[PDB]
Structure 1
Amino acid sequence: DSQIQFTRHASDVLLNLNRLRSRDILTDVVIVVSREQFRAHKTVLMACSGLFYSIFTDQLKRNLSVINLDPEINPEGFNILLDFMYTSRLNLREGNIMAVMATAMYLQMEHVVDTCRKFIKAS
């Protein structure tokens, strides 16, 4: 009938999902990146990453509780991207850009990769 749009709702949801992550509430996977580990919600990972979408949509892998990433992936770059997934904010710096871009390619995050390219273009 009469539709009403709430402009802050999606950001408020994402904030609250991040609050749950910070309390480890209903997290259902650990992502292992070399010597570090990061806990998350599979649904958020799938929503933000083609790699995680492809993993958890397969019935064969959906119920995995631990995912080991490629040993070459930089844990800092992963952490930057995980925080982006839950905040919409990307901490890109000359000192991290290459690792973040390579990690975003691996995670299949095309908009982040494109933004990294724009960052390179802007020096």
Structure 2
Amino acid sequence: MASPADSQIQFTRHASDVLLNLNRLRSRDILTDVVIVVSREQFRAHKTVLMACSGLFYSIFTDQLKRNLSVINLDPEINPEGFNILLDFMYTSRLNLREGNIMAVMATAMYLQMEHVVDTCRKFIKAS
């Protein structure tokens, strides 16, 4: 006895509402379970959201060896501004690309294994 997801009532704003509420929990540090250290800066997040948005974080936390880490030290060459823009993106679906930050954002998205964002960065370069 079943009901295929395809025949069910679609709530067109549900996914966007969930992501906005996850961002609100991040803003209040509710159930955050990791600190991402990026040179002199620290960013708290939900490992579930990191894994949902990044090949790097997916590959780290899917491994039972690293599943329970509370601190991740990113590569020391990663631009914290680049990382912060992408973390915002993960929690908002909005990507802040500017002439001043495109190379930092693109290099960081390559490291985080966010292929659709890297492609978008290549589109932004083609448009400037």
- Residues 99 and 12 of structure 1: is their aligned pair in 2 closer, same or farther, counting only changes over 3 Å? same
Structure 2 stretches of 5 or more lacking a match?
A: 1-5
The DSSP-based 3-state class of the residue aligned with 2:96 is strand
**Distance in 1 separating the partners of 2:35 and 2:71:** 5
Q: Deviations over 1:75-122 (max 9, x none)?
A: 000000000000000000000000000000000000000000000000
RMSD: 1.0
- Residues 106 and 3 of structure 1: is their aligned pair in 2 closer, same or farther, counting only changes over 3 Å? same
**Distance in 2 separating the partners of 1:3 and 1:71:** 47
Matches within 5 A, 1:32-47: 32-47=37-52
**Distance in 1 separating the partners of 2:33 and 2:15:** 22
- Relative to the length of structure 2, the TM-score reads 0.95
Moved over 6 A (4+): none
Q: Deviations over 1:21-59 (max 9, x none)?
A: 000000000000000000000000000000000000000
Task: Give the stretch that moved more between structures: 2-11 or 42-51.
Answer: 2-11
What is residue 55 of structure 1 aligned with on the other side? 60
**Distance in 2 separating the partners of 1:119 and 1:23:** 33
**Distance in 1 separating the partners of 2:51 and 2:8:** 28
Residue 3 of structure 1: how far off its partner (Å): 1.2
What is residue 82 of structure 2 aligned with on the other side? 77
Number of residue pairs matched? 123
The yes-or-no answer on 1:93 pairing with 2:120 is no
Q: Which is greater in Rg?
A: 2
**Distance in 2 separating the partners of 1:113 and 1:2:** 35
- Relative to the length of structure 1, the TM-score reads 0.99
Residue 2 of structure 1: how far off its partner (Å): 5.5
